[PDB]
Amino acid sequence: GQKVHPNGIRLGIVKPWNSTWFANTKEFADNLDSDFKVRQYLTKELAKASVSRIVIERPAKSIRVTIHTARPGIVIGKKGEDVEKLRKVVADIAGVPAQINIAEVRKPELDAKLVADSITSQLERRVMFRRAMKRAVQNAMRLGAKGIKVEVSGRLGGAEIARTEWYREGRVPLHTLRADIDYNTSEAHTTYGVIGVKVWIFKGEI
Template sequence: MGQKVNPIGLRLGINRNWESRWFPAKANLVENIGEDYKIRAFLKRKLYYAGISQILVERTAKKLRVTVVAARPGIIIGKKGSDVDILKKELQDLIKKDVNINIKEERKAGSSAQLAAESVATQLEKRIAFRRAMKKVIQGAQKAGAKGIKVSVSGRLGGAEMARTEWYLEGRVPLHTLRAKIDYGFAEARTTYGNIGVKVWIFKGEVLQKGFQAEKNEDNAPAKKPRRTRRGK
């Protein structure tokens, strides 16, 4: 099961929080989901080169707050914050609501799966060899402290007639272990030969809760030595 489903969705509520944080009335559910989609699609398209790793949407009764986590926040903020004001106005025109925007820096850009996937896709669009692009991302993640990384590319690689899938794995990526903190990212490279899909899984270690901690302590406890029995003469 862990090999098939999205690893982020599988771990929601265990070691991963939701990116849309609101509790709507039943009548507003579809409208809110549609607004979230529009906000994310607009920001991803407009701020692609800022290196966006996460877009968090929070709602209260009267307010809507959008938090953008980016590797290069300076591109979004602009000179004296002028670009943020323009972005806020464009978002308000898009969804017809008052919006507050917060910009946060992604401090560990090398260990962000979404940024890694977008990096590979950008390199493929520049006609860099796919194996070289994959290895470069793997090295960057290892330097950032990742315990494991898997990169997969699918499509007409190198302009081949037949589409295929190739992947590299360094370290370990335990997809079935729910307490494993695994980040996942997907991006598409639009090349002259067609679209190439890029998927990245990054294992950042295990997040232990009380039950898991007790189990770990029990497993790590020193084994009791068996009592020796005296032999008869």
């Protein structure tokens, strides 16, 4: 059958909300749209910047955007010229001033976004999917993954019929609520269709 979203089910318990701001019904949808605009614009032109997580905060008189990525050098540029241009555009998106705080991830392969986007990107670069998923799994275990599972599905290898392919090493206790599963999904636009990639990473409990 179908599975619940592991981030969504454990959102209230162990998973900090991406959006951690409060208001009334008057500006709920309005600021929700602004978060959508910010995130989609940010992702589209930082597709190479290995963007992993975007945390939008709304203090009473501004917006704060925390970008968890693996390549701070690219996203800042020289002397911070790029972060100021992103400041101009992001602030103009929401019509309020914007603070930008850039957090770095030392282990990219233990975060479910970097592994997912890398596996997807290899597909349109024509890397065979079996080897790609195996490379991801081996990287996670070497760099200290307690459990890994990767799901590559849809039009594998230019075949006529879509097939499901998954490979699990380690430990993925999804039904355990205290378990810490970082989940992400990424997509691959290939000449023979579109491929879904799912990654579960278990990194201990409580």
